[PDB]
Structures are given as structure tokens and as C-alpha cells.
């Protein structure tokens, strides 16, 4: 039983699903509902801005990757591992990684490859949880994610 | 993988933006 993995997969898969289909999953989040719910809401807020702001960089990258099937998704995971290969980890890289995943997920749906969205979410979660588990733990997992992106209203 | 650094840099831009929020 790996709660950190389960929670991460739940958050990331639901964002990619709702981005691809355009409809939220109105089931409540699983055990540990508070953190996961705020994490997904934060992901919508920050992730949507990332895709809007950087739609150019995302579109160019997707065009060159030429993603067509589940094989191209596994090759995609190879590129994603390089997100931390310079020794640096932060929430900005992690949210950008997930945002591109949603961008790819939308593309996978318009080419009638919705079956690859679930593998895509699992790959992203694998990269995060299986190679950066220690860093996530030190941040307090998705609680750290929520707090970092919380915007302070200091009047 | 030659695109790797692009997303790292974009990620650091996003992180540096919120780092003052
Ligand atoms: C470009 C691509 C998307 C995000 C950000 C940046 C590095 C890696 C690949 C993750």
C-alpha cells in the first residue's frame, strides 16, 4: 500500500481525464480527500495558466514528438525523466510536466487514442513518485504543492 | 531528449514566478 503513489495517480489522472474529455469527475476524491481535492483545484488553476501562457512551446514540442499511439507515450516517458537530470527539482517543473501531460492528453483524444491517456498519467506519476520520492516526502507531498502555489492576499 | 532543457527552463520560469507570491 503506497498512499503517496495512489494519491499522485488520482490527482494526475483526473486532471488529464477532465482536460481531455472536458468534463469533471464528480465523484469525491478517495481517502485523504482534503489534500487531494485542493491539489486538483490548484492544478486546474496553475495548470490551465501554464497551457494558456505556453501553448506555443507546447504545440511545437508536440508537433516534433509526433505522438500517435501507446508506443509514442512510452518514448515520451524517456524525455520526461530528463526534467530533473540537471539536479534541480521544484514545483514549477512538476506542474509544467503535468500541464504538458494534459496538453498531450487533449491531443490523444482528438486523434481517437483516448486509451493512451491512462498510460500517460501512469508514466508521469511513475517519473515523479519513483525517481523523486525523497524530495516529495520532504515537501510533505501534495500539501507542499498546495501551499507553494497558494497566492497570498496580504492587504 | 534534446528538448529536455526547454521544459526545465520553462519549469524554472514558472517556479520563479510564484516564488514571489
Ligand atoms: C519541456 C517538456 C515539457 C516539460 C517542460 C520541459 C521539460 C520536459 C519536457 C517537461
Instruction: Report yes or no: A9 and A122 within 8 Å, Cβ to Cβ.
Output: yes
Whether residue A21 lies inside any domain: the answer is: yes
Residue A122 has φ and ψ, to the nearest 5°, of -65, -40
- Dihedral angle, C-alpha A48, A50, A56, A60, nearest 10 °: -100
Residues A123 and A9 sit within 8 Å (Cβ to Cβ): no
DSSP string, A62-113: HHHHT--SHHHHHHHHHHHHGGGTTS---HHHHHHHHHHHHHHHHHHHHTT-
Experimental method: X-ray
In a domain, A34, yes or no: yes
Residue A125 is placed in which grid cell? 506519476
The full length of chain A comes to 155
**What span, in angstroms and rounded, lies between the C-alpha atoms of A34 and A71?**
35
By three-state DSSP, how is residue A24 classified?
coil
- CA-to-CA separations, A32 to A19, A46, A153, B9, B12, in angstroms, rounded: 23, 22, 27, 33, 29
- Of A12, A10, A4, the closest CA to residue A98 belongs to A12
- CA–CA distances in Å: residue A33 to residues A23, A53, A98, A140: 20, 30, 20, 15
Structural domain includes residue A154: no
Note whether residue A155 is domain-resident. Answer: no
- Which residues of chain B neighbour A92 with C-beta distances below 8 Å? 11-18
Q: How far is the CA of A96 from the centre of ligand 1 (A)?
A: 7
Domain with residue A62: its CATH number is 1.10.437.10
Does residue A84 lie in a domain region?
Answer: yes
- Selection from A70, A122, A87 nearest residue A101 by Cα: A122
Answer whether residue A68 is part of any domain.
yes
User: Which residues from A are below 8 Å from B17, CB to CB?
Assistant: 92
Q: Is A5 helix (H, G, I), strand (E, B) or coil?
A: helix
Rounded CA gap, A37 and A95, in Å?
16
Q: A91 lies in a domain?
A: yes
Sign of CA dihedral A105, B19, A141, A42: negative
CB–CB contact B18 A96 (8 Å): no
Is residue A29 domain-resident?
yes
A83 lines ligand 1 (CB under 6 A): yes
**Total domain count, chain A:** 1
Rounded-to-integer distance, Cα A34 and Cα A41, Å:
11
| Domain encompassing residue A36 | 3-149
What distance in Å separates the CA atoms of residue B11 and residue A95, rounded to the nearest whole number?
A: 8
Amino acid at each position: 500500500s503506497d498512499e503517496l503513489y495512489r494519491q499522485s495517480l488520482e490527482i494526475i489522472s483526473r486532471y488529464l481525464r477532465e482536460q481531455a474529455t472536458g468534463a469533471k469527475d464528480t465523484k469525491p476524491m478517495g481517502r485523504s480527500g482534503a489534500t487531494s481535492r485542493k491539489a486538483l483545484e490548484t492544478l486546474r488553476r496553475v495548470g490551465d495558466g501554464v497551457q494558456r501562457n505556453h501553448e506555443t512551446a507546447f504545440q511545437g514540442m508536440l508537433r516534433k514528438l509526433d505522438i500517435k499511439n501507446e508506443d509514442d507515450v512510452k518514448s515520451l516517458s524517456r524525455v520526461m525523466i530528463h526534467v530533473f537530470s540537471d539536479g534541480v527539482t521544484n514545483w514549477g517543473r512538476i506542474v509544467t510536466l503535468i500541464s504538458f501531460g494534459a496538453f498531450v492528453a487533449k491531443h490523444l483524444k482528438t486523434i481517437n487514442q483516448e486509451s493512451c491517456i491512462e498510460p500517460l498519467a501512469e508514466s508521469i506519476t511513475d517519473v515523479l513518485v519513483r525517481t523523486k520520492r525523497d524530495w516529495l516526502v520532504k515537501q510533505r507531498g501534495w500539501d507542499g504543492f498546495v501551499e507553494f502555489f497558494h497566492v497570498e492576499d496580504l492587504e | 531528449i534534446w528538448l529536455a532543457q526547454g521544459g526545465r527552463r520553462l519549469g524554472d520560469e514558472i517556479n520563479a514566478y510564484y516564488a514571489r507570491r
